């Protein structure tokens, strides 16, 4: 590592914390210490701890030359701060992936370089390691991959899993327009095979294919992306760009991955974007970036941007992956705030935390109001049973679904300082949006009818 770079950094980050405003500030979703966040990188298991990385700028909260932000925890909740794993170099340290080998965490990302020709960048694969799970040197011989059909200028975002004796890896590209997945595989992670396209946009899939993932859940591959490019359909889309999978199975002899092509969006929110899954003890964990390219970021002004998702666990219910909180996030609830009766126009005051599960009758309007308690931005959360939808109508725009309950019709509903995560149902259903107001969460009960609602607030499992 440079020395100088790496100091120069530690302690920028160090004294220019004190200036970043607190009041949007997540008390249990991973934040950037300052400056800006995107995508995250190389979820992982090593040593003993949960390790995430994710696409940082540290100098200001909108993007700039990216490096490798970095976390770990004992309980996929509860979060500290490590220092920055990766600093550009001649190369931006774009998104990737890790796996452990050995005694080391390896990571796979895209290095971005500059050139003189009408792209003006070129990307390919580097590699880089650590002994210690703090310190990460970069392979002296980088790139290790740098082949990609058509000689497509787009190649980022791999996605490393072992498979019996090789290592595979899905990456992101493009070709005349076309959005497009690739599988490589490799016996040393260094020499790596061109094995497949193993995707492609046949015109209505967008013209680039980021942060792919691939995973077998109940019993079939999921094919797990973030296309651009998609035209917002009815009511789906409407985001910049999409996160969502296909249902198939990968055929390891021939590398096919056979699909009827049926893209579903995974989160119906308004900022959701770019995920990384992991599994272990026979569970699947998915995390995401929580805000959205090319849309105001309300925390922009106050020294930062950008924090993840809750991690949720997934399952495969028929055609449909599921997403639920961990099974132990309950540790966060501090006060309990209500149970029973919530009657129609009654609210509950929570601080910048809250956790409600509610139940009404869905042969009638359920609606929520959302707003601080000093007034200013609002948020509805409603269920229309003349349309049988549920509708998120954050500050004037407009997110919904059609909603079949597979079995519970409650509705579990996630509040921190500015993000809102509705689990509908057994997690059939589920928004992630970034939510903004003046002071400590109210949440009034708009509907016709008297609701149900267990209330608690919730601790803080993050920095500030």
Known sequence: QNETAKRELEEYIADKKAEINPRYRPHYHISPPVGWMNDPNGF?????????????????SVWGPMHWGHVSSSNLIDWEHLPTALIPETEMCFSGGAVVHGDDLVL??????????????????????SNDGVNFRKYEGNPVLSYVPDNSADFRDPKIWKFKDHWYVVIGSSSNKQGRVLLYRSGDLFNWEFLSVLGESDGDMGYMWECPDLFELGGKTIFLWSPQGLEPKGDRYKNTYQTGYYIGELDYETFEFKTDKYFQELDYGHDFYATQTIQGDGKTYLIGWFNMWEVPHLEEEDGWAGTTTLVRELQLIGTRITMNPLEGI??????SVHNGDLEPQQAIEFGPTAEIILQGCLDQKIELLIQGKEGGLVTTVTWDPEVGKVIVNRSGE???????????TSWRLFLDASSLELFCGEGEVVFSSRIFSDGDWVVKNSSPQTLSVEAYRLRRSVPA
């Open 108 to 129: 796979l990302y895209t290095g971005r370089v500059t050139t003189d020709t009408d792209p003006f960048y070129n990307e390919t694969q580097y590699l880089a390691f």
């Open 330 to 335: 309950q540790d966060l609830r501090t006060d």
């Open 398 to 408: 407009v997110r919904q679904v059609e909603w079949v309950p597979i079995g519970k």
């Open 44 to 60: 992982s298991y090593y040593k003993g701890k949960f390790h995430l990385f994710y696409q940082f700028y540290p100098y200001d």
